[PDB]
Design an enzyme around this catalytic site. Structure first.
Site, mmCIF file in Angstrom:
data_model
loop_
_atom_site.group_PDB
_atom_site.id
_atom_site.type_symbol
_atom_site.label_atom_id
_atom_site.label_comp_id
_atom_site.label_asym_id
_atom_site.label_seq_id
_atom_site.Cartn_x
_atom_site.Cartn_y
_atom_site.Cartn_z
ATOM 1 N N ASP A 192 -7.733 42.418 -14.646
ATOM 2 C CA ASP A 192 -7.216 43.644 -15.272
ATOM 3 C C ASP A 192 -5.999 43.283 -16.136
ATOM 4 O O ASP A 192 -5.840 43.810 -17.239
ATOM 5 C CB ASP A 192 -6.830 44.681 -14.192
ATOM 6 C CG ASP A 192 -7.819 44.791 -13.041
ATOM 7 O OD1 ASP A 192 -9.005 45.095 -13.303
ATOM 8 O OD2 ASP A 192 -7.410 44.555 -11.878
ATOM 9 N N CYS A 224 -19.989 34.840 -25.648
ATOM 10 C CA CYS A 224 -18.951 35.654 -25.014
ATOM 11 C C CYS A 224 -18.946 36.956 -25.839
ATOM 12 O O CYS A 224 -20.039 37.553 -25.963
ATOM 13 C CB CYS A 224 -17.584 34.958 -24.893
ATOM 14 S SG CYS A 224 -16.837 34.374 -26.445
ATOM 15 N N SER A 225 -17.828 37.375 -26.446
ATOM 16 C CA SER A 225 -17.871 38.570 -27.291
ATOM 17 C C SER A 225 -18.084 38.121 -28.752
ATOM 18 O O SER A 225 -19.122 38.438 -29.348
ATOM 19 C CB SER A 225 -16.602 39.405 -27.138
ATOM 20 O OG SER A 225 -16.603 40.518 -28.019
ATOM 21 N N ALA A 226 -17.112 37.361 -29.311
ATOM 22 C CA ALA A 226 -17.205 36.817 -30.662
ATOM 23 C C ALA A 226 -18.087 35.564 -30.643
ATOM 24 O O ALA A 226 -18.743 35.259 -31.641
ATOM 25 C CB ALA A 226 -15.820 36.480 -31.202
ATOM 26 N N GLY A 227 -18.127 34.887 -29.501
ATOM 27 C CA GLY A 227 -18.896 33.664 -29.320
ATOM 28 C C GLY A 227 -18.179 32.438 -29.857
ATOM 29 O O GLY A 227 -18.825 31.467 -30.279
ATOM 30 N N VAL A 228 -16.827 32.465 -29.819
ATOM 31 C CA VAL A 228 -15.986 31.356 -30.290
ATOM 32 C C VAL A 228 -15.020 30.808 -29.221
ATOM 33 O O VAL A 228 -15.028 29.596 -28.958
ATOM 34 C CB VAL A 228 -15.276 31.666 -31.643
ATOM 35 C CG1 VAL A 228 -16.293 31.929 -32.751
ATOM 36 C CG2 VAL A 228 -14.312 32.837 -31.522
ATOM 37 N N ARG A 230 -14.259 31.519 -25.480
ATOM 38 C CA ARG A 230 -14.776 31.063 -24.189
ATOM 39 C C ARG A 230 -16.018 30.198 -24.376
ATOM 40 O O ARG A 230 -16.218 29.269 -23.598
ATOM 41 C CB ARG A 230 -15.061 32.248 -23.242
ATOM 42 C CG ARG A 230 -13.830 33.048 -22.842
ATOM 43 C CD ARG A 230 -14.212 34.482 -22.514
ATOM 44 N NE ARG A 230 -13.034 35.335 -22.366
ATOM 45 C CZ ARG A 230 -13.058 36.609 -21.987
ATOM 46 N NH1 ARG A 230 -14.207 37.199 -21.685
ATOM 47 N NH2 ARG A 230 -11.932 37.296 -21.885
ATOM 48 N N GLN A 268 -10.536 29.271 -29.249
ATOM 49 C CA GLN A 268 -9.709 30.119 -30.107
ATOM 50 C C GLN A 268 -8.199 30.068 -29.863
ATOM 51 O O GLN A 268 -7.427 30.336 -30.786
ATOM 52 C CB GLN A 268 -10.246 31.558 -30.057
ATOM 53 C CG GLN A 268 -9.986 32.388 -31.310
ATOM 54 C CD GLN A 268 -10.692 33.726 -31.274
ATOM 55 O OE1 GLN A 268 -11.100 34.234 -30.221
ATOM 56 N NE2 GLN A 268 -10.850 34.329 -32.434
HETATM 57 O O1 LIG Z 1 -10.385 34.670 -21.311
HETATM 58 C C1 LIG Z 1 -9.892 33.890 -22.103
HETATM 59 O O2 LIG Z 1 -10.181 33.927 -23.372
HETATM 60 C C2 LIG Z 1 -8.979 32.916 -21.538
HETATM 61 C C3 LIG Z 1 -7.604 33.023 -21.756
HETATM 62 C C4 LIG Z 1 -6.752 32.073 -21.138
HETATM 63 C C5 LIG Z 1 -7.238 31.078 -20.268
HETATM 64 C C6 LIG Z 1 -6.337 30.139 -19.677
HETATM 65 C C7 LIG Z 1 -5.590 29.366 -19.189
HETATM 66 C C8 LIG Z 1 -4.645 28.405 -18.642
HETATM 67 C C9 LIG Z 1 -3.657 28.021 -19.698
HETATM 68 O O3 LIG Z 1 -2.448 28.793 -19.530
HETATM 69 C C10 LIG Z 1 -8.613 30.946 -20.067
HETATM 70 C C11 LIG Z 1 -9.473 31.897 -20.679
HETATM 71 S S1 LIG Z 1 -11.196 31.752 -20.438
HETATM 72 C C12 LIG Z 1 -11.365 30.756 -18.998
HETATM 73 C C13 LIG Z 1 -12.802 30.604 -18.747
HETATM 74 C C14 LIG Z 1 -13.425 31.491 -17.881
HETATM 75 C C15 LIG Z 1 -14.782 31.389 -17.619
HETATM 76 C C16 LIG Z 1 -15.486 30.351 -18.194
HETATM 77 CL CL1 LIG Z 1 -17.163 30.095 -17.797
HETATM 78 C C17 LIG Z 1 -14.830 29.449 -19.089
HETATM 79 CL CL2 LIG Z 1 -15.737 28.176 -19.795
HETATM 80 C C18 LIG Z 1 -13.475 29.559 -19.373
#
Ligand SMILES: O=C(O)c1ccc(C#CCCO)cc1SCc1ccc(Cl)c(Cl)c1
Length: 289
Positions: A192, A224-228, A230, A268
């Protein structure tokens, strides 16, 4: 900018983290500048006929790496999907990195899956996050749903703590063999407030979704959403794990600079860039301890 040996990697992470993440900041800046001096075209993305097919105005599909849908009788732009092939470790086009499909692109999305012989979907978003629409539900809540000539049937669901596995059976109405097993790995743990505190459950999600890949099926679809953001994060983690296994080396910076020519903005944020490192740290320390 050669591969760092696996033994020196956790040490290197300390350096990158020190002095308020100065090293991480330099690396991510170098990634952001890798794009500079490079004009990469995305003409199809910017075509008026294709504009409604893009989730975000600024998130394009580079022409050279774009996934082409087989043409449809009539339209000229019926081949367009906001998707790009992306390399994996020592394998070209190991993935298809795409946006979360819109209501209007469901047929396109599912047609691309069929045409590309895609056997695995990696979904790294929730449909709605912090009261905001991220992705439209492209699969059936239960039983069967039809998207053009692709009839999608939900077979089983396993709801783990951080991710959900949905086993589908897909069929083409224009094909007479015409049945295919498609597995969807959906990462569901999205806070959240704040953002991924722990890398261990994501590492488990990567290992399990990666080992489910079937030889010699098409590319793994990652969105993901934009696909860039995550999507990029998953691709790097997965590829670097493969590199570690094969030659006990890591090349996060080099590999990321390379895939950034294949789809705009893969990984990103600096936070996602740091997250790649934590997942790998967990994988390295996990072995022998
Ligand atoms: O949500 C974000 O955009 C996002 C924003 C920040 C972080 C961080 C950090 C530590 C640094 O401070 C990670 C994510 S995404 C993390 C993630 C979740 C699920 C999967 Cl399957 C994958 Cl590959 C990666």
């Amino acid at each position: 900018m050669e591969a760092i040996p696996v033994k020196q990697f956790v040490k290197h992470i300390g350096e990158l983290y020190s002095n308020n993440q100065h090293g991480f900041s330099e690396d991510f800046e170098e990634v952001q500048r890798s794009t500079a001096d490079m004009n990469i075209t995305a003409e199809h993305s910017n075509h008026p006929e294709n504009k409604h097919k893009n989730r975000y105005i600024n998130i394009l599909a580079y022409d050279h790496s774009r996934v082409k849908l087989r043409p449809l009788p009539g339209s000229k732009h019926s081949d367009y999907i906001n998707a790009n092939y992306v390399d994996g470790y020592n394998k070209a086009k190991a993935y298809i990195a795409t946006q979360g499909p819109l209501k209007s692109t469901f047929e396109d999305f599912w047609r691309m899956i069929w045409e590309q012989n895609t056997g695995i979907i990696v979904m790294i978003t929730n449909l709605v996050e912090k009261g905001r629409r991220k992705c439209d539900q492209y699969w059936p809540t239960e039983n069967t749903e039809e998207y053009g000539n692709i009839i999608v049937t939900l077979k089983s669901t396993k709801i783990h703590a951080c991710y959900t596995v949905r086993r589908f059976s897909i069929r083409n109405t224009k094909v007479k063999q015409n049945e295919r097993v498609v597995i969807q790995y959906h990462y569901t743990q999205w806070p959240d407030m704040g953002v991924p505190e722990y890398a261990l459950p994501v590492l488990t999600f990567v290992r399990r979704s990666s080992a489910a890949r079937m030889p010699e099926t098409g590319p793994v679809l990652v969105h993901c959403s934009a696909g860039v953001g995550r999507t990029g994060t998953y691709i790097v983690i997965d590829s670097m794990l493969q590199q570690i296994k094969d030659k006990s080396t890591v090349n996060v910076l080099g590999f990321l600079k390379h895939i950034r020519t294949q789809r705009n903005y893969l990984v990103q944020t600096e936070e996602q860039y740091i997250f790649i490192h934590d997942a790998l740290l967990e994988a390295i320390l996990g072995k022998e301890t």
